[PDB]
Each structure stands twice: as structure tokens, then as C-alpha cells.
Amino acid sequence: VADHKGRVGHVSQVIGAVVDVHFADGVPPVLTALDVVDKLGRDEPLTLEIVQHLDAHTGRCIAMQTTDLLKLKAKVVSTGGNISVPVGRETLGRIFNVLGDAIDQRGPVGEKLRMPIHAVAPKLADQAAEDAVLTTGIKVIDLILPYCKGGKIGLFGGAGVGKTVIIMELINNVAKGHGGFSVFAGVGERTREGTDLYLEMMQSKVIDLKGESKCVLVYGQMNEPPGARARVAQSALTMAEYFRDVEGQDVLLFIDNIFRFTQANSEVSALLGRIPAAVGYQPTLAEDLGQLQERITSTTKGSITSVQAVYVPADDITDPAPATTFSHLDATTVLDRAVAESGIYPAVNPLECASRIMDPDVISVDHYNVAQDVVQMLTKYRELQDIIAVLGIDELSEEDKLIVDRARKLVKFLSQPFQVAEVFTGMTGHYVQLDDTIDSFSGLLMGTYDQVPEMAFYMVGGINSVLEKAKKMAEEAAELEKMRRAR
Amino acid sequence: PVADHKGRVGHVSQVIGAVVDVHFADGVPPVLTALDVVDKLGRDEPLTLEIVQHLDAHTGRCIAMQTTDLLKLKAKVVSTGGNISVPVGRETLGRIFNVLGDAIDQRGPVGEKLRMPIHAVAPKLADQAAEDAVLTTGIKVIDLILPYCKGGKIGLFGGAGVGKTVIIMELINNVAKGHGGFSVFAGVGERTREGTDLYLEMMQSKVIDLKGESKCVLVYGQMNEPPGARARVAQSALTMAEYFRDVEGQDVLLFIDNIFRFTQANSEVSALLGRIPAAVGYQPTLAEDLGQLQERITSTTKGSITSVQAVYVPADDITDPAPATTFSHLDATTVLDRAVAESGIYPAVNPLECASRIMDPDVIS
Amino acid sequence: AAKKYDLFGYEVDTNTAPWIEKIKKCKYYDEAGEVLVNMNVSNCPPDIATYNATLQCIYQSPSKQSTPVDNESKFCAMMDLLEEMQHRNRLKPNEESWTWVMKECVKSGQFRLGYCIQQVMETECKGCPADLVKANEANAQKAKTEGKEHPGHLSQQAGLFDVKVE
Amino acid sequence: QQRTSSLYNKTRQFGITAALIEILSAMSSLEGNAMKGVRRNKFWEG
Amino acid sequence: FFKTTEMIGYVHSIDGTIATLIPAPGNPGVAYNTIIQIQVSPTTFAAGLVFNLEKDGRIGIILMDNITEVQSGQKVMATGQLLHIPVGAGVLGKVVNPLGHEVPVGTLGKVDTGAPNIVSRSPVNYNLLTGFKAVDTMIPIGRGQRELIVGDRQTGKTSIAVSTIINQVRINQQILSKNAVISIYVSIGQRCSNVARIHRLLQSYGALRYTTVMAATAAEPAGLQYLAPYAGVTMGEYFMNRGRHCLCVYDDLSKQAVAYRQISLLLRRPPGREAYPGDVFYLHSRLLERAAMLSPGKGGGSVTALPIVETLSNDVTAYIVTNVISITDGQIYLDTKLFTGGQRPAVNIGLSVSRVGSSAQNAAMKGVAGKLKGILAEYRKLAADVQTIPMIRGARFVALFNQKQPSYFMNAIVSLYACLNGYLDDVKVQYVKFYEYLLVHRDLGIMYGTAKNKFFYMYVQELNYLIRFFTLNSPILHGELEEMLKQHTHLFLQHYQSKMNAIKSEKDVKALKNLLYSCKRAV
Amino acid sequence: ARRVAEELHKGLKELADYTLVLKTVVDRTIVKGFAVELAGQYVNKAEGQQ
Numbered sequence A: 001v002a003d004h005k006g007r008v009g010h011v012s013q014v015i016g017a018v019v020d021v022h023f024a025d026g027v028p029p030v031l032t033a034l035d036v037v038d039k040l041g042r043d044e045p046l047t048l049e050i051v052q053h054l055d056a057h058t059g060r061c062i063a064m065q066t067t068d069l070l071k072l073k074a075k076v077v078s079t080g081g082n083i084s085v086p087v088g089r090e091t092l093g094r095i096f097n098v099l100g101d102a103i104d105q106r107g108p109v110g111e112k113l114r115m116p117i118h119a120v121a122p123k124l125a126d127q128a129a130e131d132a133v134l135t136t137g138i139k140v141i142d143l144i145l146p147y148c149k150g151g152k153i154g155l156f157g158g159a160g161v162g163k164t165v166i167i168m169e170l171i172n173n174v175a176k177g178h179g180g181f182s183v184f185a186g187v188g189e190r191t192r193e194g195t196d197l198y199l200e201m202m203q204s205k206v207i208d209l210k211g212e213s214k215c216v217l218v219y220g221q222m223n224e225p226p227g228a229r230a231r232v233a234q235s236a237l238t239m240a241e242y243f244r245d246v247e248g249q250d251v252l253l254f255i256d257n258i259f260r261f262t263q264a265n266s267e268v269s270a271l272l273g274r275i276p277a278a279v280g281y282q283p284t285l286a287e288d289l290g291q292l293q294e295r296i297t298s299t300t301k302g303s304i305t306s307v308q309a310v311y312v313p314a315d316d317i318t319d320p321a322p323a324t325t326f327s328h329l330d331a332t333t334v335l336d337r338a339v340a341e342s343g344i345y346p347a348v349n350p351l352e353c354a355s356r357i358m359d360p361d362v363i364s365v366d367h368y369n370v371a372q373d374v375v376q377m378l379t380k381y382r383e384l385q386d387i388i389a390v391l392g393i394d395e396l397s398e399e400d401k402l403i404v405d406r407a408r409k410l411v412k413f414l415s416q417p418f419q420v421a422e423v424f425t426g427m428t429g430h431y432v433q434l435d436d437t438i439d440s441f442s443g444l445l446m447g448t449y450d451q452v453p454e455m456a457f458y459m460v461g462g463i464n465s466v467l468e469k470a471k472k473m474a475e476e477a478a479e480l481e482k483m484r485r486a487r
Numbered sequence B: 001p002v003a004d005h006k007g008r009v010g011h012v013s014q015v016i017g018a019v020v021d022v023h024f025a026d027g028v029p030p031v032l033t034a035l036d037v038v039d040k041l042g043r044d045e046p047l048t049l050e051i052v053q054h055l056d057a058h059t060g061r062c063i064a065m066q067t068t069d070l071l072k073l074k075a076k077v078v079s080t081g082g083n084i085s086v087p088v089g090r091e092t093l094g095r096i097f098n099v100l101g102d103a104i105d106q107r108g109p110v111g112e113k114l115r116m117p118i119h120a121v122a123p124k125l126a127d128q129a130a131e132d133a134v135l136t137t138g139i140k141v142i143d144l145i146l147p148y149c150k151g152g153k154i155g156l157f158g159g160a161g162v163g164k165t166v167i168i169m170e171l172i173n174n175v176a177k178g179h180g181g182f183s184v185f186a187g188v189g190e191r192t193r194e195g196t197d198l199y200l201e202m203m204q205s206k207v208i209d210l211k212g213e214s215k216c217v218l219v220y221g222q223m224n225e226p227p228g229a230r231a232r233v234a235q236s237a238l239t240m241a242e243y244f245r246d247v248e249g250q251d252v253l254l255f256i257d258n259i260f261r262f263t264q265a266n267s268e269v270s271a272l273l274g275r276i277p278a279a280v281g282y283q284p285t286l287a288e289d290l291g292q293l294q295e296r297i298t299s300t301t302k303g304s305i306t307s308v309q310a311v312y313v314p315a316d317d318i319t320d321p322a323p324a325t326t327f328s329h330l331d332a333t334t335v336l337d338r339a340v341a342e343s344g345i346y347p348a349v350n351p352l353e354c355a356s357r358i359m360d361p362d363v364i365s
Numbered sequence C: 001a002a003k004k005y006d007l008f009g010y011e012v013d014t015n016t017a018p019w020i021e022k023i024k025k026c027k028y029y030d031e032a033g034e035v036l037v038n039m040n041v042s043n044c045p046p047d048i049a050t051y052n053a054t055l056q057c058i059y060q061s062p063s064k065q066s067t068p069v070d071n072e073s074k075f076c077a078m079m080d081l082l083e084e085m086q087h088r089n090r091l092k093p094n095e096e097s098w099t100w101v102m103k104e105c106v107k108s109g110q111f112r113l114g115y116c117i118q119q120v121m122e123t124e125c126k127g128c129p130a131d132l133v134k135a136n137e138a139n140a141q142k143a144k145t146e147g148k149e150h151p152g153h154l155s156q157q158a159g160l161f162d163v164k165v166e
Numbered sequence D: 001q002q003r004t005s006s007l008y009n010k011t012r013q014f015g016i017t018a019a020l021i022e023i024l025s026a027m028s029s030l031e032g033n034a035m036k037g038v039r040r041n042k043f044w045e046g
Numbered sequence E: 001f002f003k004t005t006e007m008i009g010y011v012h013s014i015d016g017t018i019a020t021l022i023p024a025p026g027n028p029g030v031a032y033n034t035i036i037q038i039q040v041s042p043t044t045f046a047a048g049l050v051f052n053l054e055k056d057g058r059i060g061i062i063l064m065d066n067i068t069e070v071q072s073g074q075k076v077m078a079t080g081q082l083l084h085i086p087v088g089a090g091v092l093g094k095v096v097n098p099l100g101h102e103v104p105v106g107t108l109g110k111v112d113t114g115a116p117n118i119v120s121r122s123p124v125n126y127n128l129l130t131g132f133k134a135v136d137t138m139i140p141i142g143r144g145q146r147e148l149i150v151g152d153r154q155t156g157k158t159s160i161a162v163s164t165i166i167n168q169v170r171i172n173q174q175i176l177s178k179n180a181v182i183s184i185y186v187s188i189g190q191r192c193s194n195v196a197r198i199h200r201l202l203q204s205y206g207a208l209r210y211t212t213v214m215a216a217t218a219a220e221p222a223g224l225q226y227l228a229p230y231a232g233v234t235m236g237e238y239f240m241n242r243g244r245h246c247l248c249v250y251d252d253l254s255k256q257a258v259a260y261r262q263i264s265l266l267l268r269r270p271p272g273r274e275a276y277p278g279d280v281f282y283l284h285s286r287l288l289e290r291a292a293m294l295s296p297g298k299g300g301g302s303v304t305a306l307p308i309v310e311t312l313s314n315d316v317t318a319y320i321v322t323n324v325i326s327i328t329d330g331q332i333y334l335d336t337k338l339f340t341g342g343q344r345p346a347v348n349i350g351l352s353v354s355r356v357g358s359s360a361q362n363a364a365m366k367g368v369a370g371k372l373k374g375i376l377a378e379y380r381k382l383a384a385d386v387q388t389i390p391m392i393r394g395a396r397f398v399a400l401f402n403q404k405q406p407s408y409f410m411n412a413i414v415s416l417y418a419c420l421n422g423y424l425d426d427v428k429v430q431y432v433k434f435y436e437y438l439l440v441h442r443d444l445g446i447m448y449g450t451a452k453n454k455f456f457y458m459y460v461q462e463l464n465y466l467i468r469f470f471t472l473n474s475p476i477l478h479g480e481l482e483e484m485l486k487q488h489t490h491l492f493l494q495h496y497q498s499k500m501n502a503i504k505s506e507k508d509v510k511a512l513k514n515l516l517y518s519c520k521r522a523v
Numbered sequence F: 001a002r003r004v005a006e007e008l009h010k011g012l013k014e015l016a017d018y019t020l021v022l023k024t025v026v027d028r029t030i031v032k033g034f035a036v037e038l039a040g041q042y043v044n045k046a047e048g049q050q
């Protein structure tokens, strides 16, 4: 029973997306892939993945396509191994699905090798220490929660706070000039968003159809059944692993949304005979996510810079899925709806974000000191806000109002217009250098810009843009005064 | 015609609470069929069952309308040849009935011309009315903020001891007595004394002329009744109103108190039927049961039925599935709040949470 | 001549001659839109010539459909067609398209739309066919003689409490 | 403070009860769907 | 030469609106998610859908019609095909069930199709005018978009969608049928009377010619309520795949989930959160992914979705509400407090969003919307935290946003333009609606003989398409518009506002109050 | 019924070698006519109550 290739079985039960298969010669190994060879008048092929063994002959499986027109006793043939996906530079510039089949209608892909989507995570001895700052061109991220090359980044947020927008901005700022390759994994998200990304990448020449592309796309979306949404992330991760190990390249891995991987497994968990856990997720929530996350790491051979978007259901960060993902990250960016409702974008709550490289040993001393001072001032400003609410701004002392006035400028100065959100904002984006951000905030903290109007810091880039906006504000105010004077 | 299953003989196979399984050798009768237990069993009253499910080609699950005390296995049961039918017509006016249609006023026989089944199909789209007009109740809050519609559906959502019953009596006094058409009072899971008080009140007002023509019919299955009866008294009362609406083209008032007990009764039996409960613990078919019942309470092109239903909110939780699902089935919604009552304000209507459909300048001034 | 490519890089059929012939054989101009629909389905995007033919059919067609359609207007249909061409297809209307619009305005007696189209041709294109400009002015002065320069109910004097707000 | 504390302590009690009820309903559903097979034992030798 | 069906077994058990089947030994067997016919009589059949295939061979069936006729022991025939329903232009103006059966009033499309591929779509760039200034400006909707309508009971969720369908009637009559917008209104678990009232309402405005209704009333079994959205969108996919645009309204998905929960629990499916089945997200997800904007290569057709969702006490933390919000490209949140406060439609702009953005707005509306957005943002903050222009113009913007019927594009854009350029600064907030009514339905310049414009008058409805082409800030149209609004402001202030501010008599005061309230419900 | 059964048997290629047998069943749902079922192929030539 070593080689199960071509082994035959029959469908015994079909309930939703879960199908039970009976093999007379013994069920193949778990995670094995099976094809429904029977002609059932289907418009699409049917493939199953074994997830459990009910007995020595019966095996429970999840289908990757809809189980429509599936009859009992239908013949099934093993593929001799797990689900395999193509790898190599020949996949660049292409769009794939969970099964590794091109869906871009751009002709056959020349694949020299295929790898299984299920692989063992790197061990402790295969861990590399890479502490280098990643410049994303964003004031908030670069200052409070700087990102580390070869590390893991999470974008925790609700619905409509700007998770997808930030990912687009990161791609536009980090991927266009990236030395290595990029892999984008769409998981249980809107199909149109994938289409817009594909068009933008082609325009930005990341995907050069006539020339050489430098990115791969793997899409399993909402329309797909839960089986596909629970494995598309593994497929893309497998491609990135190959680029990391075989090609020895530094690769980017964008995932949106990682929560859908958990959600899909919860949907099928009920039909697998597993008692639901708290809230209603599957009991294997922590272990399943851990196996996937540990594979997303930088080893001694190569480096993977991972950016993952996490959906916090109903803005409840105490939910098991968002919480379980916090310990598997090197930099967490927590977005808040209240911030967005106030016109501040990106709607980052700096008091809830964290970074591993926020240590003087890794980053410059000035950078560390400035960030801590900003955080302390914001914390104090929030406490003073209660007093402003009850007593009023008048009753605050001289020192307190200076904190209030400076802190408000910090809150508005953290906002930044992105180059990808021009339609939303109607203004050109800005790319702020790391040094400019540190100097601008350092001067603001010590009061070098106390006389600048507050609104001059709203939706701008570096300090230079602040001065220009203040000058423009002064000019228009003078014109209004002149108009009033004539009246 | 005569049913092909009348006189069919079955034997009791399982008894659990108010749920009884019956095995028929020749085949289980159709669902909703009525069965009578023939064995004496030393009972003080007859035992009647209504089929609700089919376990197999021979076994059928049923709910008992009376208590299942002294009921043994293998007891003999006989099909009645049809669903539970109740009397209809002017003969029922001035009388009190139960779920089975038996008069409980200890007066002469009804002598009805015919009977009709409680379970019936609802009016279709083409048989719907398009008449909107204001029913003046004399109450300031209702007539102003949430005016009621003639021939429409009205609900009074409220907790315990908030004023639901009082408002109904006020509406009865101010409308039913001075009403040209007929009236039907359906008591469902409510105090038995209230029915007695209403009966005395209707006799004193001479809406029931024991020796003359009456304009009101009473149908009562109260708290003391088992869940089976409380889940069907509303159907029987509604059936009488349907006959007046259609067979006579007469305007009808339908005062139901309380409709929540109907859903509660179906929940109790559903637990025994072996069904997986929904949220809170209600039956999964909560919405469907209300839909079938409420859709029958409507005004067609033949006649009009103005319905006023009292809704009990358990634990003062307006988000409970029972009251929550009932909002979509009501033209007018009157929400009562306990805190308002504790402030000395009666009625305790919370106008912000109330609504009406005829609050349209095209209808009202 | 030169292969065209769509948004995603796939090629589009450019031989749009047969479709133009089909358009030039329609009786009611609503049927013309059906031809445009078929062209798009067949991945044969219309060119400037196709839109001009559609405008010609609208001007020369008796009515929108065999049966009358309430509030039907040839001018509205053509302007919407131009909006689709310029915005959702990125094609600049030429002189021919605007001339068809001006002819429709003159034919229909709508002399105020003619003034606006006249300026459009004088702004984007090079002037207006002086034959049509004169025809529009003749229609306008006919209204002045007959008094149909503006709807009459507008000229009726009103007041704060003399206006019926439906 | 005495009115919002009660609603907070009343909410936690309801939340615990409902979550537990959900789990047991699923447990009973998966128990009900399960069916015992024919017992393959030497019944005669009893 | 016989009409031989495919018998697959008998009916074993019946539990309400669902059933179970036992297969006869040695029979072909039935396929998953297929339709079957239960022979209630030698000539009459009841429709059912396959839902479960158990190890024992038993089959779970969702009944759809003639439930009362179903009895244990009856025969079952297998069609062996999925659900297909009639589709085409011949169904418009009719009321139908999810099975395609027409409901009397007083081509076959598959219901289980897949959504368009990633490369089969195109960016949303064509607007879909709801007719409400608030939505069209601050919450753009584009064809091929899914825009949720979430709110509490009795807040205008149904009215706004119906108005959106009605607003297309006038447009469709003028432009070619190519760009006409067809409507599929799907009523789920609603009262039968409400459907009839909606049918009459659509008929009065003549919207039935471009609209069809798919009704699954409360009295009907859960199966029909479960399939109604899929059948409704299928009728709308016929036009999408043929270079035409459609608008599908679901009223409402909240009751669909209940029906799906009812079916699953009765068929022995493990419950999940709030007793809903585990795969409740996937239900709506595959429903709304079928609404897209096809690429030029496939025709350019589209389907626009307006699913409706109900909350309890303005709680958007519920289960199904959250799932739908995470699927759609935007949400319109109708707030109860605003509704009772006199703001109608009660659109909460702060909680509402459209992820498509200005791309779903006409070139004419882009400039007005962009500047309007900044003013309101400042207005919200100024009052939250001195008669500034932002605060003067914001209050009048809110007053303009109140409506009862959809507004023609020309009338709406020109009123917003006026309030944007300060033409209403001298006008009191209470009189803004009266000012708008005179601007649209009257012409002060002609009344007082001071109109020197050549073409730009509000009574020339054909100007809507010229505006939509050139923009209101263009040399062709800018000058006459400014003069038209400059004469209108001067005449209005002089002849109307002066008298209005001089009213003290109780009779006159009451008369004015009636006028202004009527003006709210007129324009 | 026998003639119909034989015709159905002829149509079925799988049952070419199988021997035809007829088994009568009483159905109360049909008042007139008959129906024939063979290997899943069902032919109805019956009527019920009107």
C-alpha cells in the first residue's frame, strides 16, 4: 500500500461540501487528492482532498468545486499525492487558482516542476535573525511601528477601515522597486478587487506580458466553495517557499484576507463531526493557523517579507481569530473605525500598534526616542480630553494646553494621502522619507512649529508640504480679509 | 364526498408528553388528520389527536388536544376522515367555543348548517384589497402618531402587567359595540377569568342577546389548556372569521389575546417532536408558523377583517424571536414600555418605537 | 490594419463594416442599439464610424419602436450615445456627429437646444453649417410671432400663497 | 454606575448561558445523526 | 416512444416543509442538488430539491410546492437536472415564483451558475442614479456594484429601493434600450399585501414595462424563500450576458437566512452561531458575487445588487449583518433617530460608504460631489466642537437632501450647484425647499420678464444630457447657469422672502407652515 | 401492462438477457388505468379523482 496512485474508490456520502469515499484496498493517506472520473454531466471537474480517515477503508474529504450533480457510488481515482502547484520563474506574471491552473486565458504555462501545497514548517535551527528597517513611505508606520525586512506584518481592522487600501499603497511603494519577486494571495475577498489589482500591476509594469514580470497572483475568492478558500493560502505560500529556498531570493508575500482561511475551516468543521468551540469556531483554530503561519518565515536560505490583512469581526479584537493571529506577527497595525470617522487616514491607532524592532539596538536612538515621546504625548492627550470634556478647555493649565495643542497637530500630522487613494481623496499622494518623518516629528515635539496653524498638518507629507499648505492657508485667509475689508 | 381513510384503525406506539405516535396497518392518514382514541382508559373526557408528521409509511406523529393521562400503548385509535372542523355561520353568534368547536356555554345545541376545517390556504395576490382608511379609537396617542387602518392588522407589544389587555377592552368598548359587522374574540393562553368578565360585559351591553340576535363569537383556549389546544384555538377562531368575511361579505373584528402563546405552544410541542431548537430555544419553524397564520388574517375583495393582536414580550426583551418576527406581519405596531407606566403615564405607549402604515398624507389629512 | 487590444491585453475584432451595413438597414432607431449590443458581445467594439451611422439612423428613423413610447426623444438618445462614446469608450465626436444632432434639433423645432449645439460646434468643431443656424433662427422667430417662446404657465403671475405645491 | 453595572453583570450571565446552549445543541445534533450499526458479536453464546 | 421518467424511491418521512426519501433497491439513484418530482397523483407532481445524500441511502428533500398533497409512501421521479427557470424579455411586467410559475394579479437559465471570472470583469465606471441627492453625491453607486441597504424596521429600506427602480422609468423612455436599466424586485418572506401594493405602485409610474417581481410570501414554504434571490439574479443574468444592464433588489436577505436555517435544522444539520448553519456566509457570498460588470470582451453587461438587511436597535454587530457588510462594495445605513428627527431619507452619511468612489459618478457630478464632501466634513466637525461659509452651506445641503420622491438629475445637480456657490447664503434654512421648488417647477425670470438666457432654462428637460456631457463648469453652460441662478436668487429674495419674514397673522403663519412642509414632499 | 412492460424491456439494452417477470401492486392513488415501472423507467397511463 505504498504507491496509491490510480487507486479506485466510490463515493459513499455527500453532505454539502463534505464527501465520504470508500476504497476497497484502503483509504489513501490524509491530504491526498482525488479526481471524480465519473461522467456526471458537470461543466467543471470535481476534485476532493482527504482530511480524515473514518476507518481503514472510508475517508472524509472536502471538495474544491461545487458538489452539484454528484451521485453516490460515483467512481473516484487517487492522484498519487497531495495537491500540486507549479513553481518557478515561469509562473511570474500569471494568475492561478487553488489547484494551480491558470485562469488568465493567456495560454499554457511552461512548468518544469510542481510541489505539494502541504509541507512541513522550518525547524528552530532554520531561523535567521534579520533586523533591518523597511521603509514603506508612510509616516505612521515608519515612526511608531516600523516594519522589519524578512518579518511578518499584520493589518488588523474591521470592514471599511482601509486594510485593502494600505496593501495597495505598500505594493506601489515596496513592490515596484523590489529586487526580488512578489506573491499576492487573494483569499475569500471580492473578485473585483483582484481585477483592479491586476490592471494596476500591468500599468505599473510589475506584470510585463511582453517583457518579464516579477509577481504572481493566486486567487480563491468568496464565490469559491470553502474547500478552495482553505487551501489557496497554502498554494501561494508554496510558491513563495520555492522562491525562498530554490531561488534564494528575497520575496514579498501579500495575503488578503487571512481570516477567510479560518472562516472556511469553521464552515466545514461542523460537517466533519467536530464540536464547535467558543464563539463558534472550530476547536483546531489555533493549531491549523499555527502550521500555516510557521511556514511563512525567513530562513537561512532566503527571506520572506509577509504582509497579511486580518479582519476583526464586528470590530471585536477580543474575537478568537484576530487574537490568535497576534502572537504570529512581528509588526501589528491596528486600525480603528473612530479614527476614520474623524477624517484621519490611514486610520491607525498608534496606542494599540506594536513592533519588534522598536528597540534602540536595531533602529537609531533618535528614531526610538521620538516614537516614545509621540506615544506618551498621545496617551496624555487622551487623558486630558476627559478633563476638556467635563471641565472645559479653559480650566486646563498652561502646560496642559500646550500638550493639547501639540498633540492635536500630531494626530493630524500622522494622516497622509496615499498615491492609490487619489480617487477617494482627490489629491496627489506623498512618499515621505524615513529621515524626513523623524526630523519633522522631532521639531513638532519641542515646539519648533507651535505658531503654524493646526490644519496645515492635515493630509500632507513631510514638513515642507506643511509649510506650503500653511502659506496657502495664509494667502486665502488674507484674500477673505480683503474681501471683508472692501465690504 | 367521503374520505378514503375514514374509520382507519391504528394503535398507539409511543407516548411522550403531549406527543403520541400512532401505527396504522393500512397506512398513515394524511397530515393534519384528526384521530379519536376509542379505548375507555378510565379517562374523564375524550382524547383527540392531530397528525403533524409522518415517521414512515405506517407511523405518524400527533399532538393531543387534551391531557394524555391514563394513555397506554397499543390503545386503539380511529381516524375521523378529515381535519379538525369547526362550526360556522350565524348559529355560532352569541356562543362560546373551544379548540374542537364544542360549545362550552352549557346552552342548547349549536345546530350549525355545516363545518369547515381549521387549516386552510391563505388568500392569493389577486384576492387582496387596496382600501386604506382610519379607524377612530378615541385614544389620543393611537389616533395621532400610529393611526389604525380599517381592515388592517394591529399589534400591541408589551411586557407583563403593562396594559395590553386594558387597551384591548377600551378598543372593544369604543369600536366593537358600535360596529355594524361581526366580532370574534380569540383567547389564547390567557386568564380564564378575563374570558368570564368579557362574557358578562358582552351580555350586559347586549352584544350577546341570549334571546335575540348577537354580533360576537367567543373562542377560548386558555392557560390551563395543554399546548396542543393553545396551538390551534387561533386557527379555529380565524376560520370562523374567514367564513364571515368570504361567505357573507361582512366586516369582521378579530381580537386575539395573546398571540405570543401560540408561538410558545408550538415551541413546547416542537421540543417533544425531536427537532433541533433555534436561538433562545424556539422551534426552527417560528417564522413559517406565524406566516401561515397571519397571512390568513387579511382583507380580501369579498370582505374585511380588522385584526388586533396582543403580543407578550418575555422578560421585557423586545429582541426575542417571537415578538421580533411579528413586526413584519403588522400594519400598526403599538409598543408599550414598563418604565413609562411606572411614571404614572397610561397608556404606556412609546411613540418613538411605534409605527403605522397609513401615516401618509395620501391617506390621512 | 493594426491590431487593437482590450483592457486586459486580449485582441478585439476590428472588422466593423458588416455591422454598419446592418445599422443602415434598420427601420426604427431602437433596433440600432441591438446591433451595437451584438457588436460588443462579439468583441467588436464600435468605432467612430459606427456611432455616426447610429446617429444617422436615429435622425432618419420614424420612431423609436413600432409602437409609440411615451416621452421618447431623438435628441436625448443621441446625446446619451455621444456621452457613452466620449466617456466610456474614449472617442472624440467628429463634425459629422454634431451635425446630425443639429439637424435633429432643427427638424424637431427645439430652437433652444440648437443654440447650445451651435456653440458646441463653434467651440470644439469649426463653426456650424450656416444652413442649419439660419433654420434654427427662423424657428425661433416663428415662436416669437406665435408667442410660443416659453411655456405660458411660467409667464402667469404668482404669489407666496398663489402657488399650488403638489 | 449602579444601573450600568447590573446590566453588565446580567449580560455576562446571559452570554455564558447562550454560548453553552449553542455548543450542547451541536453536540446533540451530532449525536442524533449518528446511528449504531449491527452488533457483530456471538449473541447465541450468551 | 414513451415518456419514461426515472423513479428513484419512495417518500419515507415528512416534517413540515422538508421530507426524506428511501431509494428502492436496484435503481439508478439521484444526483445532488437536483430537482425531483413527488407523484402526489397519477397526473400531479410536487417539486423538491435534493439537499442531503446519506450513507444509508436516504435522501433529504426540500419541498417547494403542493406540500399539503405529499404523503408518506408516494413515488418519486428524478429529472436528473439542476433548476432551470424561464428568462427573457417576455417575463417583464409579471409576478413570478422562484420556480418561474406566474402569479395572477388582480430561454431557460440555470439557478446555480458560477460568478464571472476575474478576467471577465471590468472596473465600475457607469453610474446608476437612485434619484436621491444624498446617495448620488456622498454614496455613489455604479452598475455592477453591490450596495447594501442596512437599517432598522420602518426606516425606508424598501421605499428607497423602489424609488430607485422608479427613477429609471423616465430615463429608459428617452435613451436607447441598449442603456436601459431593467429591474428584478425580489420579495422574500414579506406579506402578500405588501407585494400587491408594490405592484400597483410600480404600475402607476409605468415601471412594470422594465421591471419584474419575484415573490416568495410568508405563507410559502422556506424552500421558495431560500431560492428566490438565486432565481431573481438568474433572471437578471440573462441581460448581463447579452450586453445589457440590470438591477436586482433583494427584500430581504435577513429572512432568507432564517429560511435556510429552518431547512438545515430540520434536515439534521449541525447548528452554528445563533443556530444558523455553518455555511451561512457562503450562501450570500455566492449570491452577491454573481453581480458584476462584464468586460468589453463579453458584452459589457452588468448586474447591480441592492440587498436589504434589518437590524435590531441599530446593532450592526449581528451575525448575518456583519457577513453581508463584509461582502458588498458599500453600505447605506438608515438610522432610526434621523428618521424620527424629520430627516428622510434617513441616510447616515457618517456610517455610510461606497468603496467604488467617484468612479461611479458622472463627470458633471464629480466636481459638485468632491467639493460638497469637504464642506459637510467640516460642518460635522464645526458643530460637534461664527457663521462660516462651510457651516452656512452645510446646513442648507442637509436641508436639500430631504426628499420623498426621486429627483431628476438636472434638477438635483443644479440645486446642489447653487447651494455650493453660495447662491443660498441669503436664503433662510427653513425656506430652502421652497426656493428649490420655484427653481425647478417655476421660472421667476420669465414671470417678471427679466430672463435674457437663450437656451438654459429649467423647463427644458433635454438639457440633462448636455449637462451630463460637458459638465456645469464649462464655458458652454457655466455662464447661462450663473445668470439663471443669479436672477432667480434676486427675484426670490425680493418678492418672496421679504413677504415671508413679514407674516405675523396666525392664519398666514399656519398657511406658510403648510406650504414649506409641502415643498419638502414635492422637491 | 404486459405489452408496455415488454416494450420497456426491449428498449433496455442491459436487460437483454434478463427474463421478464410481472408483479402487480395495488395503488389507491389511481382510480383508472395503470402504471409500469421497470429498472427505474416509469410509464403512467392512469387517472385519479377529478
Ligand SMILES: Nc1ncnc2c1ncn2[C@@H]1O[C@H](COP(=O)(O)OP(=O)(O)OP(=O)(O)O)[C@@H](O)[C@H]1O
Pocket: B158, B159, B160, B161, B162, B163, B164, B165, B166, B167, B312, B346, B347
Ligand atoms: N389605561 C390604564 N389606565 C390605568 N391603569 C392601567 C391602564 N392599563 C393598565 N393599567 C394598570 O396595569 C394593570 C395591568 O394591565 P393589563 O391587565 O392590561 O396587563 P397586560 O398588558 O394584559 O399584562 P398580562 O396580561 O401579561 O398580565 C392594570 O390592572 C392596571 O392597574
Ligand SMILES: Nc1ncnc2c1ncn2[C@@H]1O[C@H](COP(=O)(O)OP(=O)(O)OP(=O)(O)O)[C@@H](O)[C@H]1O
Pocket: B328, B356, B357, B358, B359, B360, E151, E152, E153, E154, E155, E156, E157, E158, E159, E160, E344, E345, E403, E404, E405
Ligand atoms: N423619503 C421618505 N420620505 C417620507 N416618508 C418616507 C420616505 N421613505 C419612506 N417613507 C415612509 O416611511 C415608512 C416606512 O417606509 P418603508 O416601507 O420603506 O420601510 P422599510 O425599511 O421597508 O421597513 P419594513 O419593511 O420593516 O416595514 C412608510 O410609511 C413610508 O411611506
Ligand SMILES: Nc1ncnc2c1ncn2[C@@H]1O[C@H](COP(=O)(O)OP(=O)(O)O)[C@@H](O)[C@H]1O
Pocket: A157, A158, A159, A160, A161, A162, A163, A164, A165, A166, A345, A346, A417, A418, A421, A424, A425, E353, E354, E355, E356, E357
Ligand atoms: N487612504 C484613504 N483615504 C480615504 N479613504 C480611505 C482610505 N483608505 C480607505 N478609505 C475608505 O475606505 C474605503 C476602502 O475600504 P477598504 O480599504 O476596502 O477596507 P477593508 O478591506 O478593511 O474593508 C474607501 O472607499 C474609503 O471610503
Ligand SMILES: [Mg+2]
Pocket: A163, A164, A189
Ligand atoms: Mg478589503
Ligand SMILES: [Mg+2]
Pocket: B164, B165, B190
Ligand atoms: Mg392581559
Ligand SMILES: [Mg+2]
Pocket: E157, E158, E159, E251
Ligand atoms: Mg420593507
